[PDB]
Amino acid sequence: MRVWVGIDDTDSSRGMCTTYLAVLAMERVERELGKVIGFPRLIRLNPTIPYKTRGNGAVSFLVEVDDVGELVDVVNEVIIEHAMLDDEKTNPGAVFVDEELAVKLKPFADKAIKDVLQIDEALFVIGKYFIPHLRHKKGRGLIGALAAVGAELEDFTLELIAYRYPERFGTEREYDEESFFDMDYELYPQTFDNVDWCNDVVVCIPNTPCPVLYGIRGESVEALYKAMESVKTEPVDRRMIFVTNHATDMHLIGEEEVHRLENYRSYRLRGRVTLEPYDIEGGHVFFEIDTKFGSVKCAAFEPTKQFRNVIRLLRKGDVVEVYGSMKKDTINLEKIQIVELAEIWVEKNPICPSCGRRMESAGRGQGFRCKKCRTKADEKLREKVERELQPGFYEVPPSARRHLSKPLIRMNVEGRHIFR
Ligand SMILES: Nc1ncnc2c1ncn2[C@@H]1O[C@H](COP(=O)(O)OP(=O)(O)CP(=O)(O)O)[C@@H](O)[C@H]1O
Ligand SMILES: [N-]=[N+]=NCC(=O)NCCCCN
Ligand SMILES: [Mg+2]
Ligand SMILES: [Mg+2]
Ligand SMILES: [Zn+2]
Numbered sequence: 001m002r003v004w005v006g007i008d009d010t011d012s013s014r015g016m017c018t019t020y021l022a023v024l025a026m027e028r029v030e031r032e033l034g035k036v037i038g039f040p041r042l043i044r045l046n047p048t049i050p051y052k053t054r055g056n057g058a059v060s061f062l063v064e065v066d067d068v069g070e071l072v073d074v075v076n077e078v079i080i081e082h083a084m085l086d087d088e089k090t091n092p093g094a095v096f097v098d099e100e101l102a103v104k105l106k107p108f109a110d111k112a113i114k115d116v117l118q119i120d121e122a123l124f125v126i127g128k129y130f131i132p133h134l135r136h137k138k139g140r141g142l143i144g145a146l147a148a149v150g151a152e153l154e155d156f157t158l159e160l161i162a163y164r165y166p167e168r169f170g171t172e173r174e175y176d177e178e179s180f181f182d183m184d185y186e187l188y189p190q191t192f193d194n195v196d197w198c199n200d201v202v203v204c205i206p207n208t209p210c211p212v213l214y215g216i217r218g219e220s221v222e223a224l225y226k227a228m229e230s231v232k233t234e235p236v237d238r239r240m241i242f243v244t245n246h247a248t249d250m251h252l253i254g255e256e257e258v259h260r261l262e263n264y265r266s267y268r269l270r271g272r273v274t275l276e277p278y279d280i281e282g283g284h285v286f287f288e289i290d291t292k293f294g295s296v297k298c299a300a301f302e303p304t305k306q307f308r309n310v311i312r313l314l315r316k317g318d319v320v321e322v323y324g325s326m327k328k329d330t331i332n333l334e335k336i337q338i339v340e341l342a343e344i345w346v347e348k349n350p351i352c353p354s355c356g357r358r359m360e361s362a363g364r365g366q367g368f369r370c371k372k373c374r375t376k377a378d379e380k381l382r383e384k385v386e387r388e389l390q391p392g393f394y395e396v397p398p399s400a401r402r403h404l405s406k407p408l409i410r411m412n413v414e415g416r417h418i419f420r
Pocket of ligand 4: 009010011012089090091
């Protein structure tokens with residue numbers, strides 16, 4: 001029968017990752033029980049959650065097997081031989097679900113991506129639907145496991161993950177930097193967010209001691225595969241393509257959707273600027289705005305680099321839309337849409353019609369003049385100031401992009417200030 005297998009929490013900060021474990025588990029199924037139908041899914045979840053670092057993404061894949069219990073056994077073996085069970089950080093979870101049963105997990109998954117979950121719940125669910133599972137330590141991996149099975153994908157992107165030969169691991173990666181940029185020129189936007197031009201950093205490569213070499217994001221399999229051959233790196237052992245929820249803002253809740261705001265949730269909301277920009281300590285920029293929910297702290301943190309510039313040009317009265325997560329009672333900006341420019345009427349003194357300099361007052365009510373000529377004028381000129389800010393959309397540079405952050409290149413809207 002056809003069965004969805006879901007895994008996560010199989011990584012420590014040492015040298016495993018959920019996916020590599022999942023890719024192994026896949027290989028073993030292809031050889032013992034049956035075959036993997038389609039692509040595996042790499043479902044990122046609520047990115048604010050504690051003990052998630054780094055990045056919060058479960059895995060799942062569909063199979064055909066004559067016996068369910070066998071499948072589990074094979075999955076169970078895999079976990080035991082590869083998961084860092086030593087680490088109190090990691091507590092693997094796995095689920096096994098009928099084709100026809102997965103639809104029922106859409107709400108649970110949705111909550112896993114936009115909310116916070118107790119293990120109680122996942123346990124209750126597994127009880128309810130008589131779902132075969134594996135919990136190996138704490139059953140925490142079971143939340144993510146279920147979610148990677150229930151997540152419905154309206155929008156989706158692809159990531160071609162390439163893994164190393166295990167000899168190297170914890171070592172550094174040899175790779176051709178230019179060959180990566182060259183690729184991006186040729187195939188953008190079919191392969192987006194794999195390099196930051198403005199900062200000369202290749203983005204699709206981890207610092208971490210994990211098995212990933214590169215994980216390349218894109219739209220088609222044809223694009224992706226083109227990325228591969230075009231890239232020069234130290235040899236590749238395993239390679240899988242995952243259909244993912246990266247770059248879909250799937251984590252975002254809109255202002256029409258709830259009473260209050262909470263920490264550990266991400267939001268899209270419209271706001272008028274109250275406080276103005278003011279730098280803080282590490283290289284940050286703060287400002288408050290006003291909403292249906294009251295006064296709300298919004299920030300661009302130092303790792304946003306340039307993007308701080310477009311924030312620093314914010315004035316009281318600006319109408320804006322913000323995109324980010326709420327932690328420590330403040331919005332960490334992913335994108336921003338300047339909605340209505342706030343117009344500023346001012347009354348400066350008359351410019352002198354000869355020299356160009358500003359006329360100075362000539363008395364209590366004696367108008368203005370320019371002594372360097374014999375020129376004069378009696379009232380003040382009112383204007384609108386013309387600041388360096390165009391309406392529309394602005395995003396953080398790709399090296400500061402969060403996994404779920406939908407980048408401008410993928411929204412068909414107007415006024416998109418894509419910086420390259
Ligand atoms: N919304 C949520 N509420 C509560 N717990 C959640 C949750 N989303 C995920 N979790 C759980 O927290 C744990 C996350 O730590 P984990 O190591 O598994 O990274 P996972 O997907 O985040 C990641 P990666 O491939 O980079 O290595 C998982 O057990 C997961 O099930
Ligand atoms: N493409 N890709 N893979 C991952 C990625 O985009 N990382 C972005 C940079 C995150 C900063 N630590
Ligand atoms: Mg996970
Ligand atoms: Mg873990
Ligand atoms: Zn003059």
